Amino acid sequence: DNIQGITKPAIRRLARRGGVKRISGLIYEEVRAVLKSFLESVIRDSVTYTEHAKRKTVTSLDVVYALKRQGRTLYGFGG
Amino acid sequence: DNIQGITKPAIRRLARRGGVKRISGLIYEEVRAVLKSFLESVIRDSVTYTEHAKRKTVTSLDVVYALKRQGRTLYGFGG
Amino acid sequence: TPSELALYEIRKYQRSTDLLISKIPFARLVKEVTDEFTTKDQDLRWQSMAIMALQEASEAYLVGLLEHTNLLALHAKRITIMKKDMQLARRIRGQFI
Amino acid sequence: TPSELALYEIRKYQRSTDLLISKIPFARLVKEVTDEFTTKDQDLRWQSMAIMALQEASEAYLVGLLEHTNLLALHAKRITIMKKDMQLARRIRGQFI
Amino acid sequence: QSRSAKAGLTFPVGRVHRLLRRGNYAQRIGSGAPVYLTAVLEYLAAEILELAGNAARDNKKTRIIPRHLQLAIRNDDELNKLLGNVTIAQGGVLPNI
Amino acid sequence: SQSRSAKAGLTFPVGRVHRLLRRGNYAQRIGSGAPVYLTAVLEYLAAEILELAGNAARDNKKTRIIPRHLQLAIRNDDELNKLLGNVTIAQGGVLPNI
Amino acid sequence: WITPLVIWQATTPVDVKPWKLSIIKRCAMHPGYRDAPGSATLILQRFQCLVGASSQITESIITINCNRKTLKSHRNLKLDAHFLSILKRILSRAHPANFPADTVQNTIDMYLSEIHQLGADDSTVSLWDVT
Amino acid sequence: SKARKETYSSYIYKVLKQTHPDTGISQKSMSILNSFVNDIFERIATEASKLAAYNKKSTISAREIQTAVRLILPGELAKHAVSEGTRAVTKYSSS
Amino acid sequence: KARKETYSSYIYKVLKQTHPDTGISQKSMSILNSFVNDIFERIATEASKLAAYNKKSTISAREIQTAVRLILPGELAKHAVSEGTRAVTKYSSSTQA
């Protein structure tokens, strides 16, 4: 599975960019779960936006607006 | 003057409502400081609303409007 | 035992719904704070229902902060809420900061 | 010493600005997730700049969560981020929960 | 015979129509929007009132209180997440167990 | 005839802002002095951020301004970090911390 | 009463003199005071923030430390509100546009807050560096 | 002498009596319910207006309102809400 | 040959006055456009909300000044209001003369 495709070195890299030194073995699954939940929310919002737009293709505009719905505004796209 | 006027039994009742069973000494004036900060943050926008309205009294509508602007919506006070 | 009385009053404040901070001192506090923000030409005016609204929001925020500090205390293996725990709660929730 | 190499690569990732998760697997992940949400009549369509946008927001959120977990770890006197610490960070920030 | 009487909605329809027109939300308003919004509002109000009433049944009191309203809202996890940012006046806090 | 952008001494446009406010469906009527005030404040904010980004680039001694520089300036300035606490910048990275 | 005072006028590493440290520490070490260990702890803490780390001053405090409820009460300085309220009015009346009442109360408060913080905690100047 | 207060009080009371007549309402609960209804209506209306303005749609219709309520209300309540709303609109059109 | 409204050349000219030479990437230009659009939208929404609150059909210089004072922290807000006041006074005086 490609959710398992997220490799352990990637999660180690992420936690270290956060600023950790030692990482336990139970962190990777929780990181995958939280990423899955955030993705589920953003995708559901983007999909309902594009379903209203009666288009079979989503757009960076719709992704930005899902992000603005979540309150995490993203810059450098759309406009 | 009245910052110490907020008496420590009130903070004790707040701590008991929160659910703790042990109390230190620093938390007293830390609660006083955080209350002062929250009060100033709300009061600034409440006074801004009142002054813009050209009225020279502060009302429940103005304070709940300031709270909703902050994001901590308050119910049961009308408007 | 102190724990018995402590837990009894925890029960009563868990099913209590009254204000815990003195009304006249709180009114004076907000009174003098909003006079501090004011120019010398005028003085502001305030209303009782506004005072209750501000107090109610204030203790909603305070109860949230204090229960989060209690959770941090449980994390730190200490039943005592302390200075570093309160600092950490304030930082992590990070409102108007 | 392991600490020397660890700190060197911490330096390089502190002044690094590239994506850290593989592009094709991430694209497949979002691909299959959004097909999972779909009815059987159609299939959705996606675009590369949208993929970068979603990935960028995802790792912004992830870096925030991980640095908060590191702060909790410092609070708990342990240099190791662990299950309870991550649970606590997720709860306290409490987004879409 | 009122439009609300035909619609079967307790909440009025022309009221919502005039509110939508007054609020300049759009340059031109529709006709099914007021009835749809009124129906949604009535459903939500009936749901919250019924849950508060059930909380009252469990409270064996003929008078319902903001205490019971907070009980219903916070006990329903979905409603709590929908209304996470609001604070109920004189609502109290939930018992630990 | 010179433009009232030139009357206001503002590089940012006033007519475009006025049209956007008229067609933005914000209020029933738009004030005459509203667009000039809005253009002035927008230009002041943009100029301040551009000055900060240019200072950051000069400190970094590259003539090109990058999202990394923009994020660095925004996160280093408290008055801007307060206004932009939640928004994230694409390809901005994280401010280096000890 | 002079213990809160001594905290105030001495704000420099120079005023933190070892002969002054010996006198303050010995009084706390002296048995017949009943208040020097409470008084010396704040003075030593005030002297700590002035000179820096001062590993010599933390070894003296831990020897003279108390249950620190009284130290919390000793950290707080109780000044009469009625005394200061009249003083603010008196100062403003005598000297207009001098010693404002708001700052007079504020100046006392930060002097009081300094005591509270103890528990938690031709000479050549170049015109080139003048900013 | 006083401009009438625009509330939903009579309709909320009627809904409660339709459900069950034994109990009553307190004034604070009444204000809480009024504020909640007003907030929900404002949220939905603002969302519909913003969504219509996005697709340069000059008008607001049932489709836009349904999409807005799907955006705001979580799916569990949204299913029942859209079902009942569609029922109401279709029966109103029939009438 | 249809022109799309975007504050690109104007920000380029502002940078030209700021420094004799300074390059900006396309991503940086898009970020600046998004930021200015966000700020304009926030201020316009605040002004419209204030007008709706005060039962006023129109917004004006005072309305926008109050709105921007609300949005910005006071330190930048005083600079912004000084900007607006001197700009509007000099614009009105030029028309009269």
Coordinates of C-alpha atoms in Angstrom, one line a residue, chain E residues 16-22 24-34 37, chain H residues 45 48-49 58-61 65:
Chain E
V16 CA -36.2 34.6 5.6
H17 CA -36.9 35.9 2.2
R18 CA -36.8 39.5 3.4
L19 CA -33.8 38.8 5.6
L20 CA -31.9 37.5 2.6
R21 CA -32.9 40.5 0.4
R22 CA -31.9 42.9 3.2
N24 CA -27.2 42.1 0.2
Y25 CA -25.6 38.7 0.1
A26 CA -26.2 38.5 -3.7
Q27 CA -27.3 40.9 -6.4
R28 CA -30.3 38.8 -7.2
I29 CA -31.9 36.3 -4.8
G30 CA -33.8 33.1 -5.7
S31 CA -37.1 31.6 -4.6
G32 CA -36.2 28.1 -3.3
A33 CA -33.4 29.5 -1.2
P34 CA -35.7 30.9 1.6
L37 CA -32.8 27.6 4.5
Chain H
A45 CA -26.0 32.8 4.0
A48 CA -23.9 30.8 -0.2
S49 CA -23.1 34.4 -1.1
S58 CA -25.3 36.5 -10.0
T59 CA -28.1 34.6 -8.3
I60 CA -28.5 32.3 -5.3
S61 CA -30.6 29.2 -5.8
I65 CA -27.9 26.7 -0.8

